[PDB]
Design a protein around this nucleic acid. Structure first.
Lengths: 98, 170, 130, 47, 270, 194, 184
RNA sequence: UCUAAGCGCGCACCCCGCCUCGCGCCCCGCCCGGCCGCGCGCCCCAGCCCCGUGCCCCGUCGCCGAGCGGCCCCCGCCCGGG
RNA sequence: CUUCGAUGUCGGCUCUUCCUACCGUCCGCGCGCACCGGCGCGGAAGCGUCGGAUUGUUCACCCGUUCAAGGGAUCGUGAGCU
RNA sequence: CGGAACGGCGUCGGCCGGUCCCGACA
């Protein structure tokens, strides 16, 4: 595929950023593993992250924007908001720039 | 928290041509809180309120932090039933931290917040006259005790994400 | 409590707090709750730290009464414990920690690739010896 | 009817104390009955 | 209000649900205790019920009303067709109760026993056990499989085909009732007793000693969907009653607004 | 991932496990008849027997079912912290597998123990803690002895196995003088430090 | 910094080894090991004196050290001499009849208020009962360790209980008397 | 000194067995096939015995074979009598 | 406060569940506890708490018995009855 | 552990006091 040659560091798409009442699907929360402090989520800020859309067989990419929390979770948005079935799948931060 | 010293005078009138400068030392988190305490004391003790007086100056003093000293504090407090007098002795390097310890212990055990306690007097006493028994043990030449909580050295819990191959040994 | 007791001069590793990782000599036992620490060599400015932060290290350095700073530096320099702790395994893991500290995103890409190579080799050695 | 033995048995039985709130046997010199914690109420009965 | 005068909830609740028994006929469910080191004996047998009698007996019961006096008692005769061991079954004590290990059938399954597998015998394939009969009967597969049962399973049982032809029942299809060797000195001794009995007739006289007490388990007689008056023993409501006297007056109170499990209602009485 | 629930507070561990099931990692808890519930036994038993008393009064079957065995206790505990009604939750609860002892698939899986949820560390001495097994045979699990019979077996065989593994494991690093040496300087001690 | 210690010195005859919290004590009568892992104690031995040394004493932690040093003393006293907690059966109109059964490890007591049932007491591990010719109706319970033999005594007084009637008049029963250390 | 540790006992109550139901599950019989995964020391925290690590790559290039585990497949009535 | 475009309305019958501030039984202690009785507690809802005369009776009374505690459930229970 | 008058050698503290190295009839 377009990106079958980037090694990547694992990450898990936990859920849409959502208050106990309102839900915003315009943002998505990726908990990048290997990150346990908010300050260290800066080392990954702005990188391409791709989800393996089960139905398409094609990766829907997206980019990290801002740290979301003290624990280390980061907010990122994608080319089209994730369907919701894809929730809990594996998202990959590509180690390589492209 | 910062051990300010506050100087103030009553506003000058014709009948009392000059007031007397009255100085108090108030331990408070920030200078603005400190001035409220300097006036509340001078209202109860010398019948002069804030509107009728000008705070001449507020002065932050920073003590030496390099050496440990045994601080005894006399602190009046308010319980649900009423007012009581107390003497709590703590050991801390700077009089601000000794005050901090008193305001977390008398607030932690005696459930009175800063606003209800009037510090009758803070003093640094020598080892020979220390009265409370807790300051008495660590007053010794060499005090050897095992670590109180070696258990708390498991802060690695978040790092390991609770997936360590074997249980840690303390 | 059979060894490694909080006392005067025990070299300690401040696990948590703005000083993370730094190893400093304990100077005065302020209270059972909190103990004075000051490491002239490892640039830990003297401060009172809660005992919880300190992680006791077996090496204990001889100290004079209430050394403050000027005396402590000469004592730290004279004591062989500061070098010896690093020589022991926890000291070398402490040093491995120092290297893992300056992590860069690009570096992680070089590390993960090397890590996969070790894992694949481990199955290969396992295949070789039955 | 026995002599020295009925004295030992009395110590095991007649000798003791009973707190009114707890209604339970307590040691002879105890300040407070274990069940009726802290009460001073006490008494024993005899033949 | 409340119950006013106090009565009892008629009918033991343990026996609920009162339904047509799904099991084909009486099933053991629980077998007597093992008691290792006991005389090696078999625990159970299957029979078919027959008519009752009126036997007269002498009661030597010390300190009794009828001590040393003639009395008559009532007994039910049961035909005991002699059974034949058709197979040995093992059970291993396991975290989930009993899980079975290596059941072994006999070299030749009995002709009535074969009939059990098929719903009809004449109009059927009759192919069951075809591989097994060829597989065994050389006395090798039987021996190794029995050895597996002895090594990995503590509890041993005898599958027994009962013969229906000897009795007047038109069943004609053997029923299989499991029996358990109990009291064997060690696991090995029980299996060897069963193998000797493999394909061998056992009569009840061997299974149950005279004058012992035994338990009778059977699908009880029924009368069809019955009214509450017999199904649960509720008292008949007063003669003058619209919609009929025979029925429970109130099936629940308003606040527990549903019918409670214990409330009496019509059900299969048998 | 397989967790030796020996020594982990049923409560502390169950929180950490629900989050990973919601993160789709599929975790199986083994030795879950060895969880320590905090509190005295004569008291941690009362609150459970209260939760076996609460049963629907119209028909006990329609209302809450209560599971006496320890494996289904640590599943019911972790169920409260999973949206089981929702389909995200239904898959997550399914992903969890609970085994008392280590009977089949888990007998060979690598085992990870959580330090944060570990009871020995988590509670102060003198808190008083009861193993789920002591509660289990008290509320009504009849196979506690039928679990001791499998668990004792596994350890005895494992000990001979460990002795055998010692030899093969020693032979592993005797031959670690090959490419494994080159990648180590290149990574482990290259200041990468990993 | 605070600690509670009650240094107890091992007698020259007795030998004790403390591994973890478990202490093996041997002397003349026999070897008794007690598990003391029920509490925090730095039970360091050393020298010729065991030390209990509890650390950071809170309210309960002050009690543990003395109790576990008094207990360790009971282990030493028991191995050199043994505690002979003897008892005396007391009867009124109906005399109590006692029989040693299993080679001095068991007792059967009957005719307590002419009660048809015969009471049976089995001795705990490490104790033996003996009928005594020294006094009428005196039973001697002799044991290696106090906990094992004293607890035998607790069962005997309890087994012989008058069911009803006021205890002061109806005082029939066996009762422990001398707690002295002499017979094994 | 009845409790603080430790320990003996102890309610027509409770819980369990026995007893009624049973989702599922299992061993054989018929049949004997298909399919997926690759991962094991234990014990103990007041001896914690040299600790305070490790993994951190499930496609990322891993999937052979075995050994271990799982998954799947089955298996009529009508018709008479009770 | 809720129901007047109506929640059928006292008791009895009948039937199920609960509650405990326990009347007898079960349990250990206390007494002005010799015994037998009686009494005072604390745990305990497993079980029993009836048959009748008069009145619609909820009561109330009386007679007898293996001596007989109170209550709740829309004053439980009218497309269950009367 | 909705909630009192009362109790609690339960546990950490404080206040006002007397003793006792003429070591708490020897």
């Amino acid at each position: 595929e377009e990106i079958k040659g980037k090694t990547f560091l694992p990450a898990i798409f936990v859920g849409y950023q959502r208050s106990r009442a309102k839900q915003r699907e315009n943002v998505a929360l990726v908990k990048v593993s290997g990150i346990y402090t908010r300050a260290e989520t800066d080392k990954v800020l702005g990188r391409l992250i791709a989800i393996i859309h089960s139905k398409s067989g094609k990766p829907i990419f997206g980019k990290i924007c801002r740290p979301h929390g003290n624990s280390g979770m980061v907010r990122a948005r994608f080319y089209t908001n994730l369907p919701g079935q894809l929730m809990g799948h594996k998202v990959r931060v590509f180690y390589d720039n492209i | 928290m910062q051990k300010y010293i506050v100087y103030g005078r009553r506003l000058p009138s014709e009948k009392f041509p000059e007031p007397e400068v009255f100085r108090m030392t108030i331990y408070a988190p920030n200078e603005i809180v400190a001035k409220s305490r300097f006036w509340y004391h001078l209202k109860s003790l010398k019948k002069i309120k804030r509107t009728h007086g000008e705070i001449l100056d507020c002065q932050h003093i920073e003590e030496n932090g390099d050496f440990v000293k045994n601080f005894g504090v006399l602190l009046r407090y308010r319980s649900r039933v009423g007012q009581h007098n107390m003497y709590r002795e703590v050991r801390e390097t700077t009089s601000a931290r000794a005050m901090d310890k008193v305001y977390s212990e008398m607030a932690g055990q005696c459930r009175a917040r800063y606003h209800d306690i009037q510090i009758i007097n803070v003093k640094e006493v020598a080892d020979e006259d220390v009265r409370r028994e807790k300051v008495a043990m660590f007053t010794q030449k060499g005090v050897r005790f095992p670590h109180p909580c070696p258990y708390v050295h498991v802060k690695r819990a978040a790092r390991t994400a609770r997936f360590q191959d074997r249980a840690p040994h303390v | 409590s059979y060894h490694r007791f909080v006392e005067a001069g025990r070299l300690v590793y401040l696990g948590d707090g703005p000083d993370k990782g730094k190893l400093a000599v304990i100077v005065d036992i302020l209270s059972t709750a909190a103990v004075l620490i000051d490491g002239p060599t490892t640039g830990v400015k003297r401060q009172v730290v809660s005992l919880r932060w300190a992680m006791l290290t077996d090496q204990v350095i001889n100290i004079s009464e209430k050394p403050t700073t000027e005396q402590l530096k000469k004592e730290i320099e004279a004591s062989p414990a500061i070098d010896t702790f690093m020589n022991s395994v926890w000291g070398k893991k402490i040093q491995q920690q120092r290297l893992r500290a300056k992590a860069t995103f690009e570096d992680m890409g070089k590390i993960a690739k090397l890590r996969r190579e070790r894992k694949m080799a481990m199955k290969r050695i396992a295949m070789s010896i039955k | 009817m026995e002599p020295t033995l009925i004295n030992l048995a009395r110590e095991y039985n007649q000798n003791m104390m009973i707190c009114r709130h707890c209604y339970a046997r307590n040691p002879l010199r105890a300040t407070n009955c274990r069940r009726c914690r802290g009460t001073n109420l006490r008494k024993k009965k005899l033949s | 209000s409340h119950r006013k005068f106090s009565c009892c909830r008629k009918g033991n609740l343990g026996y609920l649900p009162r339904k047509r028994c799904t099991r084909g006929r009486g099933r053991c469910k629980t077998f007597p205790p093992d008691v290792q080191g006991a005389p090696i004996h078999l625990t159970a047998f299957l029979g078919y019920k027959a008519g009752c009698t009126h036997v007269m007996r002498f009661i030597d019961h010390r300190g009794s009303n009828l001590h040393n006096r003639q009395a008559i008692d009532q007994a039910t005769i049961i035909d005991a067709p002699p059974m034949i061991c058709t197979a040995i079954i093992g059970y291993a004590k396991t975290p989930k109760g009993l899980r079975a290990v290596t059941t072994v059938w006999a070299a030749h399954i009995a002709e009535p026993a074969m009939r059990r597998f098929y719903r009809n015998y004449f109009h059927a394939e009759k192919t069951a056990f075809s591989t097994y009969m060829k597989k065994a009967a050389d006395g090798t597969y039987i021996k190794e499989q029995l050895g597996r049962l002895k090594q990995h399973a503590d509890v041993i049982r005898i599958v027994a085909h009962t013969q229906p032809a000897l009795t007047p029942l038109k069943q004609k299809k053997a029923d299989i009732m499991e029996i358990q060797v109990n009291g064997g000195a060690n696991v090995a001794e029980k299996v060897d007793y069963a193998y000797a009995l493999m394909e061998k007739p056992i009569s009840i006289k061997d299974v149950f000693s005279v004058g012992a007490q035994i338990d009778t388990i059977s699908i009880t007689r029924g009368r069809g969907f019955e009214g509450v008056v017999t199904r649960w023993g509720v008292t008949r409501l007063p003669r003058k009653t619209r919609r009929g006297n025979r029925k429970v007056a109130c099936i629940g109170a308003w606040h527990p607004a549903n019918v409670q499990y214990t409330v009496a209602r019509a059900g299969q009485m048998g | 991932i397989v967790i030796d629930c020996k020594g982990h507070i049923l409560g502390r561990l169950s929180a950490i496990v629900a989050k990973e099931l919601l993160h789709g990692h599929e975790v199986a808890l083994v030795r879950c008849e060895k969880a320590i519930i905090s509190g005295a036994f004569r008291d941690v038993k009362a609150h459970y027997l209260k939760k076996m008393h609460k049963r629907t009064n119209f028909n006990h079957l329609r209302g809450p079912f209560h599971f006496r065995a320890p494996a289904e206790i640590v599943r019911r505990t972790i169920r409260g912290m999973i949206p089981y009604k929702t389909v995200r939750g239904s898959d997550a609860m399914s992903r969890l597998r609970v085994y008392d002892g280590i009977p089949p698939c888990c007998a060979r899986y690598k085992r990870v123990v959580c330090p944060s949820a570990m009871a020995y560390l988590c509670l102060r001495p003198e808190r008083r803690r009861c193993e789920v097994g002591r509660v289990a045979h008290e509320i009504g699990w009849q196979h506690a002895a039928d679990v001791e019979r499998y668990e004792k077996r596994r350890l005895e065989e494992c000990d001979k196995w460990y002795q055998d593994k010692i030899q093969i494991d020693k032979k592993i690093a005797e031959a670690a003088e090959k490419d494994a040496e080159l990648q180590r300087i290149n990574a482990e001690l290259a200041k990468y430090g990993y | 910094p605070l600690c509670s210690s009650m240094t107890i010195k091992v007698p020259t005859d007795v030998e004790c080894t403390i591994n973890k919290r478990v202490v093996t004590v041997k002397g003349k009568k026999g070897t008794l090991v007690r598990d003391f892992s029920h509490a925090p104690l730095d039970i360091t031995h050393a020298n010729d004196t065991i030390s209990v040394a509890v650390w950071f004493p809170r309210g309960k932690r002050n009690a543990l050290p003395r109790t576990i040093c008094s207990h360790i003393e009971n282990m030493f006293k028991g191995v050199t001499y043994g505690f002979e907690y003897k008892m005396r059966l007391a009867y009124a109109h109906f005399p109590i009849a006692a029989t040693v059964v299993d080679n001095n490890k068991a007792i059967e007591i009957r005719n307590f208020m002419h009660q048809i049932k015969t009471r049976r007491i089995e001795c705990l591990p490490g104790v033996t009962i003996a009928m005594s010719t020294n006094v009428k109706d005196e039973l001697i319970l002799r044991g290696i360790s106090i906990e094992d033999v004293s607890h035998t005594a607790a069962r005997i007084h309890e087994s012989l209980k008058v069911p009803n009637k006021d205890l002061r008049k109806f005082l029939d029963g066996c009762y422990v008397s001398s707690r002295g250390l002499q017979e094994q």
